[PDB]
Design a protein around this ligand. Structure first.
Ligand SMILES: [Mg+2]
Ligand SMILES: [Mg+2]
Ligand SMILES: [Mg+2]
Ligand SMILES: [Mg+2]
Ligand SMILES: [Mg+2]
Ligand SMILES: [Mg+2]
Ligand SMILES: [Mg+2]
Ligand SMILES: [Mg+2]
Ligand SMILES: [Mg+2]
Ligand SMILES: [Mg+2]
Ligand SMILES: [Mg+2]
Ligand SMILES: [Mg+2]
Ligand SMILES: [Mg+2]
Ligand SMILES: [Mg+2]
Ligand SMILES: [Mg+2]
Ligand SMILES: [Mg+2]
Ligand SMILES: [Mg+2]
Ligand SMILES: [Mg+2]
Ligand SMILES: [Mg+2]
Ligand SMILES: [Mg+2]
Ligand SMILES: [Mg+2]
Ligand SMILES: [Mg+2]
Ligand SMILES: [Mg+2]
Ligand SMILES: [Mg+2]
Ligand SMILES: [Mg+2]
Ligand SMILES: [Mg+2]
Ligand SMILES: [Mg+2]
Ligand SMILES: [Mg+2]
Ligand SMILES: [Mg+2]
Ligand SMILES: [Mg+2]
Ligand SMILES: [Mg+2]
Ligand SMILES: [Mg+2]
Ligand SMILES: [Mg+2]
Ligand SMILES: [Mg+2]
Ligand SMILES: [Mg+2]
Ligand SMILES: [Mg+2]
Ligand SMILES: [Mg+2]
Ligand SMILES: [Mg+2]
Ligand SMILES: [Mg+2]
Ligand SMILES: [Mg+2]
Ligand SMILES: [Mg+2]
Ligand SMILES: [Mg+2]
Ligand SMILES: [Mg+2]
Ligand SMILES: [Mg+2]
Ligand SMILES: [Mg+2]
Ligand SMILES: [Mg+2]
Ligand SMILES: [Mg+2]
Ligand SMILES: [Mg+2]
Ligand SMILES: [Mg+2]
Ligand SMILES: [Mg+2]
Lengths: 53, 124, 53, 210, 147, 124
RNA sequence: GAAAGCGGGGCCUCACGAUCCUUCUGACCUUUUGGGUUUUAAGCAGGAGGUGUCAGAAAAGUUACCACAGGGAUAACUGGCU
RNA sequence: CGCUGGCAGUCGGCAGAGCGAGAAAGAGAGUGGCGCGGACGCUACGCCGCGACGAGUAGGAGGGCCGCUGCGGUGAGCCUUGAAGCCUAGGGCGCGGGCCCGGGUGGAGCCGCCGCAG
RNA sequence: AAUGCGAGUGCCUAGUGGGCCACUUUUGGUAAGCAGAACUGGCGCUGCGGGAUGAACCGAACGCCGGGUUAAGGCGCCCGA
RNA sequence: GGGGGGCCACGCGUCCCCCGCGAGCGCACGGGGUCGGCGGCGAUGUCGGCUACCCACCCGACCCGUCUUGAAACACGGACCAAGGAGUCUAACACGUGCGCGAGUCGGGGGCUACGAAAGCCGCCGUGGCGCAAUGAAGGUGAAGGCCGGCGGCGCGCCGCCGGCCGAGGUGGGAUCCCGAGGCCUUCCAGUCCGCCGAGGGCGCACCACCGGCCCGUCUCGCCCGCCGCGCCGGGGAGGUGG
RNA sequence: GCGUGAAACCGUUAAGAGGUAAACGGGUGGGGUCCGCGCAGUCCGCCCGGAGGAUUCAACCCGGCGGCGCGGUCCGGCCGUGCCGGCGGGGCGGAUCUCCCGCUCCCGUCGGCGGGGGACCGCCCCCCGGCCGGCGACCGGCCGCCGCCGGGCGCAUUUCCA
RNA sequence: GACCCACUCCCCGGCGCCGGGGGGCCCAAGUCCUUCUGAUCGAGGCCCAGCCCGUGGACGGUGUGAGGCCGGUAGCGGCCCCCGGCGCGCCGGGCCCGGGUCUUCCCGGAGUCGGGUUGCUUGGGAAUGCAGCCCAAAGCGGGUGGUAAACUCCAUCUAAGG
């Protein structure tokens, strides 16, 4: 969508501090598990070592 | 092609409905305002349409606006526009067949001698 | 979606194919619901043919 | 046997190509080796620039590229002589020299001379003896701010001269470009035979007088 | 993905999709482009007309760089400069005409295919075609030659 | 949206079991424990869960409040019903019908609450 | 032929031949490479020189000293039909 | 296989429970003369309803919650209170490929689901 | 005009390119379970009922079953009648 | 038309030719089965188990693979069992399909900054490839026009020459969309809004058929226009034809 | 030559069978081996009747929490792939234009060009006012209604339990 | 050679001194309580220091399956030797040096280039390269300028030494 909420920054003790950051527009991008799978299963082959007899 | 297919008389103030992609065409200078529904609109076509002052809808927005698709003009791209269709039809090397052959490259000595010249052999 | 990426050369967030994705709220909206026919939810199973003779 | 429709392909796999196969599995290994060698060289020449000597402004030949400009191999001896730099001392202060280059033009020559002057203005020269300064070298306040340059020295950038929208004049509206191209092509093609025919016309008509 | 291939569905079938009568022999018609004159002549003439023979003059030391002449049509003439170059001349009242250098954009010859908007231009080009210069003169403009 | 994340979780969720020609869900708020859009306990804005109490007796009814949707710590409100077998069946039915809180799960909640009370009885 | 008309071979159904190469003819023709002139050479277009195994490899035997892949698609025995 | 069939209407005390019927179209708005109640459903890649049809070599296509091995994720998975493997006049499921339990043997690792690879 | 049926169109494409038999027409041959054609149907690729047996004949083509009825054939016994 | 049995015939009040809601109650040849009907046996010998172990009987039933027109063949391979065992990988091309961007697209080579030899980034690193322009052997060339006014020439039209305005073709079929003659009932007519249908009429997507138009090569017929070099110069027109 | 110890093949025990070689498909029958841990036979909901037992129902009071709110338009916030304004401040980009500065031709004068401003335009960010619209991918306080929980009061013709 | 301007510091070898590589040794925390086993490294627990350490939860061994039993691992962690680089001072040596404008002089690789022919080779096509034989040079010369040859201009290098 287009509505970007106001996320709260938490302190190291677990409680909320006074700082608020608006939600980045990255988190409203479309969810495409097919493209994530296509990118993952093609980029995961790039760290492979060759094997041969 | 969208401008010419919506410039026709009678179809003013209508929604052009595209199932494919609305791409920009840069050999045109004036863009009138257009109410657009498409699956995808390219980034430079979107800028030109919104600067012209029209609206760009998606298909859920079109379903909310006109559930029965009233006041709409369905449009589609040229289906024979692809390069694949020049190699289709009657075979090359046959009388009255302007079918593009499959060559590794084009040039002087790439399939231009025996089936093409009246001097060397024959011409179809 | 209106400001491009500053640390990349030319990258924008991708466009949404479908803005409102909650098709339940889309379908039970009065805009869509008035332009529908009556639902034919009556089940008509097969009839055992008795001989009229 | 050929299928219905397709290309006539000529694969060059008729020799023993499987013996001479070059795989690139050591490409990320040679990139790290080149990077480590580059950084070791950059630490070896500590205030000197990492790219090396300065390369001159050079036009490209062979009409596909004659509008672009490029980094050449070295400054020519004419350029160094106009700039006032000795050819056996220029290589000691990071000026790349090759003696093969000629200078057909004047504009590229003076551009490379200006290139040498602006680099000479930017050169911070350390004394040969660190404990005692010399005559033609930088002062002590510049040596402590002297750093190492990253990337090519004075990078070469293609500039285009911007021109105003001018009001078109009546004689520019009368210029026939295609007619000029065709007549210039014809006059280049027919120059020799016209001169030979004029020579024959002057040779046949001078026989009449004698 | 070998699991998606045809071979995995051909286990148990004897001829492996290749026929009982006509077996999958090694090269039953020759290797490569064999028999273009003799027994593949019908395919070579019905699909590759002109493949055999000599046409034209030879050029021994041909380098592609001498005949380098990229072309641009006049329907792409206004895309080489910015949009505020074009609209400033439209709002302009003194009749000044912007200059388009196609050699800077990487084109040598200007051909004239599409329309031009009714506003003056000064096109600098290495070569011009006749309809290209007449469509510039008709809209009102200059065709400057450069070398 | 709920439909959008259902299209992600319909086949590759960690709560999904597919064996013996059946499918289920081990989701915390999935009453009837089956994999479906209607009964999924995490994609919806208003969910109802019926679980046994921490000790031997009672039925805990869990709802999801509308305010904190991205805040799962304070999202779910929990109530404990340690009463007889009939007033809890009236109470949960009231909590769903009178509040109009996701009303197509009322008989599923009652059928789960009856099963928990039957399970908390002494065995024979 | 007065003309209507007829005729671009034989009253009709046969009398014949690709690529590569060579040879001749045709143009105030193109290229011959950094340019110019002139020979030469390469092109473009139309005929010919020929493949009769006639959609066109350049090609003599013998093997009882024999060899291989095959064939009952094919002979020399029997058995069958006649 | 076809009907490119039907179901988002589970529209509930902010309620009124329907679209099988021979005949293009609205159970339309306005303007003047006590008892707190109502089964199932809907993995929409799901569920349901009508018809018609079912041979197969060579061959082609689709579906496999058929099977083997390894990898990325995931089952707060299984396991010396007994894993893999093997045997079985035991109980079963699936049209089938195959699979799950029971008994015995054995002594240390193994499997289900979503994808990937051979 | 009658009868009946939803059609039109574009890509990619395996296997095959040894066939054989029968009513009728028909060539060579004394003839052949011989050699060679035309048309249609089969066998090949196909099980089932009958011709005792059976590539091709007669009937009839096939998902797993229950009831009924038939085709071609049959109904002394083998062997249903 | 006049003077005993079956009829899906049973109103009143007119004009006139022929002379829009009654309630109830049960029965059932009525949108596919029920009983609001019963009886026997069952703890050391009996109940159920189709499948699986063995055996018996009736009917059926030749050993598989392969080549072949035809195999059970007096055609070849095969005693039996376990393990291994045969359409793979790279390159190239075509077509279809999925994704991203889109007249652009792509960093594959290079460079920057445990898993990680991964991932990220470069844009004046997009060089370069492919696509955006074809055609000719090549020199080369290189993809709408029409109307009007004025001037010059030819003898009212044409050509050439300067200014204005209109402007990317048409015919047929064409999913979809637009208008709407009239109408979709509840006591009766006018009567506005929201919908729904519809005679007829239109703009017509993609795609197909056709007729035109434009670019390059070539052929034929021809008359003109340009100037820095007036020429074996350059440019144009009409009609076929090859791509 | 000793983990696990399959099949082919063999020995023995047990069971069954045996003159058309064995084996097989369909249909039953008989005998075994084990299993159902069979052998008096399913429970579930409502209502009625009979024997009992609770610290018990409805309605009120207090406190907490949740839902909804066209609170026609309550107060305050946040967002907008929303729109206009400004005696507003800023960053990127532009083939829109133009005081000092290097160097260059001709006498500190005088012209072209390399280089930072400056102006213009587009977009974005942050401050200001206005509406619009959202808070169902994104809410807080009072108020109103409803629901639930806990604790009181209920002393049992109510409610619940076997 | 003359006229002017400008250099007082380059290299190596020893003497002695100043801050990467190889080797050796070592550095955290449970064998804590119940419990299964033939043996535990299994299971349960260890409160409010959420058992203890963690820059160490890689691996291996130890009577199954161990971060905490042990070797190890982490750490710009430590300690002890050896070698080398990077520098400074000193001694004994060398070297006794340049740039610019005029003036006068000088300057090049031969049985090689190249030509014919033969054979191999190349994409190199009237001969790309190599080699044998024959001929055999020139000095405003010679080679190259991807079609053989003549004339005439241009452009570009300087072969047959390293
Ligand atoms: Mg084939
Ligand atoms: Mg098959
Ligand atoms: Mg085979
Ligand atoms: Mg195949
Ligand atoms: Mg074959
Ligand atoms: Mg093959
Ligand atoms: Mg032949
Ligand atoms: Mg004629
Ligand atoms: Mg005659
Ligand atoms: Mg003999
Ligand atoms: Mg003989
Ligand atoms: Mg042999
Ligand atoms: Mg035979
Ligand atoms: Mg015989
Ligand atoms: Mg079938
Ligand atoms: Mg067994
Ligand atoms: Mg064959
Ligand atoms: Mg015959
Ligand atoms: Mg058939
Ligand atoms: Mg048959
Ligand atoms: Mg008989
Ligand atoms: Mg029957
Ligand atoms: Mg009989
Ligand atoms: Mg029998
Ligand atoms: Mg065989
Ligand atoms: Mg045979
Ligand atoms: Mg066959
Ligand atoms: Mg057989
Ligand atoms: Mg026999
Ligand atoms: Mg054989
Ligand atoms: Mg044998
Ligand atoms: Mg095996
Ligand atoms: Mg594709
Ligand atoms: Mg062991
Ligand atoms: Mg053993
Ligand atoms: Mg016995
Ligand atoms: Mg261990
Ligand atoms: Mg423990
Ligand atoms: Mg360990
Ligand atoms: Mg521990
Ligand atoms: Mg330790
Ligand atoms: Mg340690
Ligand atoms: Mg260490
Ligand atoms: Mg030599
Ligand atoms: Mg050799
Ligand atoms: Mg060779
Ligand atoms: Mg020359
Ligand atoms: Mg030449
Ligand atoms: Mg040398
Ligand atoms: Mg040399």
């Amino acid at each position: 969508a287009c509505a970007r909420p106001l996320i709260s920054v938490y302190s190291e003790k677990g409680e909320s501090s006074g700082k608020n950051v608006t939600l980045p527009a990255v988190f409203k991008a479309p969810i495409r598990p097919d493209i994530v799978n296509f990118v993952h299963t093609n980029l995961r082959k790039n760290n492979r070592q060759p094997y041969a007899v | 092609r969208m401008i010419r297919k919506m410039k026709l008389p009678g179809r003013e103030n209508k929604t052009a409905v595209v199932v494919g992609t609305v791409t920009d065409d840069v050999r045109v200078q004036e863009v009138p305002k257009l109410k657009v529904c498409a699956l995808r609109v390219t980034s430079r076509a979107r800028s030109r349409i919104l600067k012209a002052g029209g609206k760009i809808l998606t298909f859920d927005q079109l379903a909310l606006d006109s559930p029965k698709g009233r006041g709409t003009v369905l449009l589609s791209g040229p289906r024979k526009g692809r390069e694949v269709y020049r190699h289709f039809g009657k075979a090359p090397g046959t009388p009255h067949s302007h079918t593009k052959p499959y060559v590794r490259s084009k040039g002087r000595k790439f399939e231009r001698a025996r089936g093409r010249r009246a001097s060397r052999g024959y011409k179809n | 979606w209106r400001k491009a990426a500053s640390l990349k050369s030319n990258y924008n967030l991708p466009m949404h194919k479908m803005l409102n994705t909650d098709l339940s709220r889309i379908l039970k909206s009065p805009e869509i619901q008035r332009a529908l026919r009556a639902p034919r939810k009556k089940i008509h199973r097969r009839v055992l043919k008795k001989n009229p003779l | 046997a050929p299928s219905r429709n397709g290309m006539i392909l000529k694969p060059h796999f008729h020799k023993d190509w499987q013996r001479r196969v070059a795989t690139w599995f050591n490409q990320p290994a040679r990139k790290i080796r080149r990077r480590k060698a580059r950084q070791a060289r950059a630490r070896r020449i500590a205030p000197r620039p990492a790219a090396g000597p300065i390369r001159p402004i050079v036009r490209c030949p062979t009409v596909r590229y004659h509008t672009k400009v490029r980094a050449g191999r070295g400054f020519s001896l004419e350029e160094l002589r106009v700039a006032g730099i000795h050819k056996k001392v220029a290589r000691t202060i990071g000026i790349s020299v090759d003696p093969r280059r000629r200078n057909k033009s004047t504009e590229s020559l003076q551009a490379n001379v200006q290139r040498l002057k602006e680099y000479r203005s930017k050169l911070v020269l350390f004394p040969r003896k660190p404990s005692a300064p010399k005559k033609g070298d930088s002062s002590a306040e510049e040596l402590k701010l002297a750093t190492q340059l990253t990337g090519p020295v004075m990078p070469i950038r293609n500039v285009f001269k911007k021109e105003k929208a001018r009001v078109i004049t009546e004689e520019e509206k009368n210029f026939k470009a295609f007619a000029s191209l065709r007549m210039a092509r014809a006059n280049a093609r027919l120059f020799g035979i016209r001169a030979k025919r004029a020579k024959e016309a002057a040779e046949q008509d001078v026989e009449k007088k004698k | 993905p070998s699991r998606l291939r045809k071979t995995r569905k051909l286990r148990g079938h004897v001829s492996h999709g290749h026929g009982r009568i006509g077996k999958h022999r090694k090269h039953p018609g020759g290797r490569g482009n064999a028999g273009g004159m003799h027994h593949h002549r019908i395919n070579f003439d019905k699909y590759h007309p002109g493949y055999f023979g000599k046409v034209g003059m030879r050029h021994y030391h041909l380098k592609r760089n001498q005949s380098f002449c990229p072309t641009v049509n006049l329907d792409k003439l206004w895309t080489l400069v910015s949009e505020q170059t074009r609209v400033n001349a439209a709002k302009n009242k003194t009749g000044a005409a912007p200059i388009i250098d196609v050699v800077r954009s990487g084109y040598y010859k200007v051909l004239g295919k599409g329309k031009l908007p009714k506003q003056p231009v000064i096109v600098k080009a290495k070569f011009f075609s006749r309809r290209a210069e007449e469509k510039i003169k008709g809209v009102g403009g200059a065709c400057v030659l450069v070398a | 949206s709920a439909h959008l994340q259902w299209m992600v979780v319909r086949n590759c969720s960690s709560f999904l079991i597919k064996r013996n020609k059946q499918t289920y869900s081990t989701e915390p708020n999935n009453l009837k424990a089956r994999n479906s859009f209607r009964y999924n306990g995490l994609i919806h804005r208003k969910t109802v869960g019926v679980e046994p109490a921490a000790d031997g007796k009672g039925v805990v009814v869990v709802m999801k409040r509308r305010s904190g949707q991205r805040k799962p710590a304070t999202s779910y409100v929990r109530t404990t019903i340690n009463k007889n077998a009939r007033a809890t069946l009236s109470s949960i039915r009231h909590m769903i019908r009178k509040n109009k809180y996701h009303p197509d799960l009322r008989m599923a909640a009652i059928r789960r609450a009856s099963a928990i009370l039957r399970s908390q009885k002494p065995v024979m």
